[PDB]
Amino acid sequence: IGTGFPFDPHYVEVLGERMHYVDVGPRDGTPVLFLHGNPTSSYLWRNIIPHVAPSHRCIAPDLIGMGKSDKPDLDYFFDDHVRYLDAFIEALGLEEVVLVIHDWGSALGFHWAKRNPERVKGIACMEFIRPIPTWDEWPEFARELFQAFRTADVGRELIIDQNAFIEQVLPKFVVRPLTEVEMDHYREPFLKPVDREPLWRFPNELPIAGEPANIVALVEAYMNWLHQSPVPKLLFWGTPGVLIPPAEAARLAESLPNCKTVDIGPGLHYLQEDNPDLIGSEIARWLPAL
Numbered sequence: 627i628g629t630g631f632p633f634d635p636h637y638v639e640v641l642g643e644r645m646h647y648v649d650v651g652p653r654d655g656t657p658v659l660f661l662h663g664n665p666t667s668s669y670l671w672r673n674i675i676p677h678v679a680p681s682h683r684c685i686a687p688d689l690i691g692m693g694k695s696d697k698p699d700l701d702y703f704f705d706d707h708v709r710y711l712d713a714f715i716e717a718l719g720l721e722e723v724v725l726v727i728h729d730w731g732s733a734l735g736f737h738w739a740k741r742n743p744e745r746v747k748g749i750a751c752m753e754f755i756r757p758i759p760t761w762d763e764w765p766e767f768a769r770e771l772f773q774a775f776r777t778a779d780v781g782r783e784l785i786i787d788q789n790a791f792i793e794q795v796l797p798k799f800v801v802r803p804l805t806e807v808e809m810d811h812y813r814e815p816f817l818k819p820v821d822r823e824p825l826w827r828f829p830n831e832l833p834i835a836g837e838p839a840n841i842v843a844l845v846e847a848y849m850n851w852l853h854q855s856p857v858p859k860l861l862f863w864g865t866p867g868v869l870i871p872p873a874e875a876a877r878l879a880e881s882l883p884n885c886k887t888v889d890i891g892p893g894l895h896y897l898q899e900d901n902p903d904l905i906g907s908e909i910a911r912w913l914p915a916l
């Protein structure tokens with residue numbers, strides 16, 4: 627599995643700030659927009675995009691505060707990310723898109739799709755965010771750590787001062803071992819502790835046990851939309867998963883309309899690091915019929 631990032635950089639001004647993005651592939655069709663989450667960047671899609679770029683334009687932004695994008699002096703709430711991604715999409719003049727989404731990129735993508743349903747031609751998703759009713763639905767192997775992330779003082783000491791989202795969560799949530807070169811790519815945006823704010827705000831935004839209420843309500847709204855939507859869907863899952871265990875992927879195969887599931891094999895949360903070639907090949911095979 628490749629460790630390089632052989633993509634020309636692009637930057638667009640969005641709400642006064644520069645956002646980095648990959649933009650490869652042919653420019654005369656429906657683009658495929660890849661949305662990462664915490665604590666990643668477009669680097670997460672590096673081995674998937676080459677499967678898709680022969681046939682389709684691939685656009686993969688770095689969320690504000692992350693990757694090679696600018697770092698404004700924000701609290702990095704979900705709604706900050708909503709504003710910047712909305713403006714990014716308009717700044718590129720995109721009309722219709724196919725979404726390929728993961729983690730907080732999935733909350734962004736589903737929320738955008740709910741608000742712009744006639745512009746979404748397909749959704750490929752994996753390890754996406756749904757309301758989490760209680761901590762019992764969070765895997766036991768990461769329960770105490772994510773409870774600490776959401777504990778006053780403690781969580782900032784872990785994520786800001788110790789860089790735990792990069793140094794602990796990434797290896798914990800990839801089945802295979804990550805290489806030093808890969809880790810150093812993921813570390814690059816967050817060498818300075820102050821810049822780790824988005825990494826801490828994100829787990830404190832997760833919709834767990836009804837809080838924070840704003841996020842619970844917006845996630846419930848986009849999930850209601852997705853369960854009713856005829857849009858084509860492609861859902862990748864692994865065993866044992868983190869947000870989406872195998873039994874839930876099997877239930878979603880029925881409870882989401884026009885949904886095709888793909889078992890990637892062993893996988894936790896960053897499924898793209900365990901089986902990028904099947905994720906890219908299956909997205910490429912599914913696009914033409916959209």
Ligand SMILES: [Cl-]
Nearest residue numbers: 664828829832
């Ligand atoms: Cl998170």
